[PDB]
Enzyme design. Structure first.
Site, PDB file in Angstrom:
ATOM      1  CG  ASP A  38      -1.893   1.138   1.261  1.00 59.08           C
ATOM      2  OD1 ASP A  38      -1.978   1.888   0.241  1.00 59.08           O
ATOM      3  OD2 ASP A  38      -2.576   1.296   2.300  1.00 59.08           O
ATOM      4  CG  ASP A 220      -3.366   4.509  -2.757  1.00 61.94           C
ATOM      5  OD1 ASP A 220      -2.665   3.565  -2.321  1.00 61.94           O
ATOM      6  OD2 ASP A 220      -4.408   4.891  -2.223  1.00 61.94           O
TER       7      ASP A 220
HETATM    8  C1  LIG Z   1      -5.249  -2.366  -5.466  1.00 63.52           C
HETATM    9  C2  LIG Z   1      -6.063  -2.450  -4.276  1.00 63.52           C
HETATM   10  C3  LIG Z   1      -6.737  -2.523  -3.288  1.00 63.52           C
HETATM   11  C4  LIG Z   1      -7.554  -2.599  -2.142  1.00 63.52           C
HETATM   12  C5  LIG Z   1      -8.751  -3.276  -2.226  1.00 63.52           C
HETATM   13  N1  LIG Z   1      -9.603  -3.395  -1.207  1.00 63.52           N
HETATM   14  C6  LIG Z   1      -9.196  -2.797  -0.086  1.00 63.52           C
HETATM   15  C7  LIG Z   1      -8.028  -2.089   0.112  1.00 63.52           C
HETATM   16  C8  LIG Z   1      -7.780  -1.468   1.401  1.00 63.52           C
HETATM   17  C9  LIG Z   1      -8.146  -2.089   2.577  1.00 63.52           C
HETATM   18  C10 LIG Z   1      -7.958  -1.436   3.781  1.00 63.52           C
HETATM   19  C11 LIG Z   1      -7.407  -0.173   3.830  1.00 63.52           C
HETATM   20  C12 LIG Z   1      -7.014   0.442   2.659  1.00 63.52           C
HETATM   21  C13 LIG Z   1      -6.437   1.833   2.632  1.00 63.52           C
HETATM   22  C14 LIG Z   1      -6.280   2.349   4.028  1.00 63.52           C
HETATM   23  C15 LIG Z   1      -4.957   2.336   4.742  1.00 63.52           C
HETATM   24  C16 LIG Z   1      -5.525   3.636   4.225  1.00 63.52           C
HETATM   25  N2  LIG Z   1      -7.458   2.682   1.967  1.00 63.52           N
HETATM   26  C17 LIG Z   1      -6.835   3.228   0.990  1.00 63.52           C
HETATM   27  C18 LIG Z   1      -7.477   4.164   0.007  1.00 63.52           C
HETATM   28  C19 LIG Z   1      -5.410   2.802   0.948  1.00 63.52           C
HETATM   29  N3  LIG Z   1      -4.537   3.249  -0.012  1.00 63.52           N
HETATM   30  N4  LIG Z   1      -5.166   1.968   1.907  1.00 63.52           N
HETATM   31  C20 LIG Z   1      -7.223  -0.214   1.471  1.00 63.52           C
HETATM   32  C21 LIG Z   1      -7.174  -1.987  -0.961  1.00 63.52           C
END
Ligand SMILES: CC#Cc1cncc(-c2cccc([C@]3(C4CC4)N=C(C)C(N)=N3)c2)c1
EC number: 3.4.23.46
Length: 375
Positions: A38, A220
């Protein structure tokens, strides 16, 4: 060859819809967990308690190198939330660099609509900067610890496919063709960048370029869609609708909340236009463009039930927190998060998207004889 780039290739699994993830271990002896890669967050946060959607989780009592930090963390999002406890422990990436570091970990003890059913990961590796870490910027992110504690260069690259490859500490030339084009990292919080021009099938949207970055634009890997500020999203849609007007789709399609399906093998790719996002260059008023095919922005939804057909969600959606270049934008590109030089590179990926007519592309330089960024 442990820790060679060759060994890091193909170390990611998953898809744009549910996340791409890499194997990691935490604790001693090592507990193996799958972790969302992430770039849109900065906490290393891991399920540390049973949950309906979790196949496994971090058990701190079984780790004798765990250290409690006696500090809670509560993180709410627009969609769902998590609550946990901070500590540190030993962390390695079995198909990453040949190293073990001591890193901050948030042990998630409660959460609401955070974990994703059938995504097959149990935690998130936030790769962005400390400025957006929770509860605050004094909680060192994983990558910072890695660079601090090892000889790993301060750079990683992501090749997302649709698993892919996260290459830490270097650039794997076998993962791209043509040139690598760099855009500056505007500020070290999210991976913030500047979009200077947007075309749809080569037609300029003709907006003041600040609109493309209201109120920020980020790269992202933890976001599925290309997300666009309202004004831009509306123009994009009007333009894509015009381009594909030989077929009409329900408004729910355009709102991202509804599939469109064609008989297997018959998706009419040719009626959908390409999208070009011009990114700010490393020299004044020079830019390059990355071009996105419908194969990217129409996200296939695998479902045995609908499998006589090919079905898709529209993976461009409206944002009120700035532009997000998510996974469907990154797929088919090799993306270099060059933290050391404060820049992000794009090159055509070995797993890029194309048909016999068109292809994903990274092209420059373009010259434009205004500041496109917001305050
Ligand atoms: C590719 C992909 C993907 C994906 C699919 N489902 C869920 C997630 C998912 C699940 C939980 C949290 C997050 C989160 C959050 C930490 C801030 N939220 C955001 C916008 C991001 N960048 N990370 C994403 C990611």
């Amino acid at each position: 060859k442990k820790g060679s780039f060759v060994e890091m290739v193909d170390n990611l699994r998953g898809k744009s819809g549910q996340g791409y993830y890499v194997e990691m271990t935490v604790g001693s002896p090592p507990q193996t967990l799958n972790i969302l890669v992430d770039t849109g967050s900065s906490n290393f946060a891991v399920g540390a308690a049973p949950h309906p959607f979790l196949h496994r989780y971090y058990q701190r009592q079984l780790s004798s190198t765990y250290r409690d930090l006696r500090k809670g963390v509560y993180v709410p999002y627009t969609q769902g939330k998590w609550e946990g406890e901070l500590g540190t422990d030993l962390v390695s990436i079995p198909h990453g660099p040949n190293v073990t570091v001591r890193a901050n970990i948030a042990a998630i003890t409660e959460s609401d609509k955070f974990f994703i059913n059938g995504s097959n990961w149990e935690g998130i590796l936030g790769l962005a900067y400390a400025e957006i870490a929770r509860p605050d910027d004094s909680l060192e992110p994983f990558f910072d610890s890695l660079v601090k504690q090892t000889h790993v260069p301060n750079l990683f690259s992501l090749q997302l496919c649709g698993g892919g490859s996260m290459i830490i500490g270097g650039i794997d030339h076998s993962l791209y063709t043509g040139s690598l084009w760099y855009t500056p990292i505007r500020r070290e919080w999210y991976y913030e960048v500047i979009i200077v021009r947007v075309e749809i099938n080569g037609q300029d949207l003709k907006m003041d370029c600040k609109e493309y970055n209201y109120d920020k634009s980020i790269v992202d890997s933890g976001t599925t869609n290309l997300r666009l500020p309202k004004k831009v999203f509306e123009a994009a849609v009007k333009s894509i609708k015009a381009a594909s007007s030989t077929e009409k789709f329900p408004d729910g399609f355009w709102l991202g909340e509804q599939l469109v399906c064609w008989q297997a093998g018959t998706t009419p790719w040719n009626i959908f236009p390409v999208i070009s996002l011009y990114l700010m260059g490393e020299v004044t008023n020079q830019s390059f463009r990355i071009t996105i095919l419908p194969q990217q922005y129409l996200r296939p939804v695998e479902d045995v039930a609908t499998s006589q057909d090919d079905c898709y969600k529209f993976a461009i959606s409206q944002s009120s927190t700035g532009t997000v270049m998510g996974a469907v934008i990154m797929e088919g590109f090799y993306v270099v998060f060059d933290r050391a030089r404060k820049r992000i590179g794009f090159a055509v990926s070995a797993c890029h998207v194309h048909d016999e007519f068109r292809t994903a592309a990274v092209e420059g330089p373009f010259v434009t004889l205004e500041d496109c960024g917001y305050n």
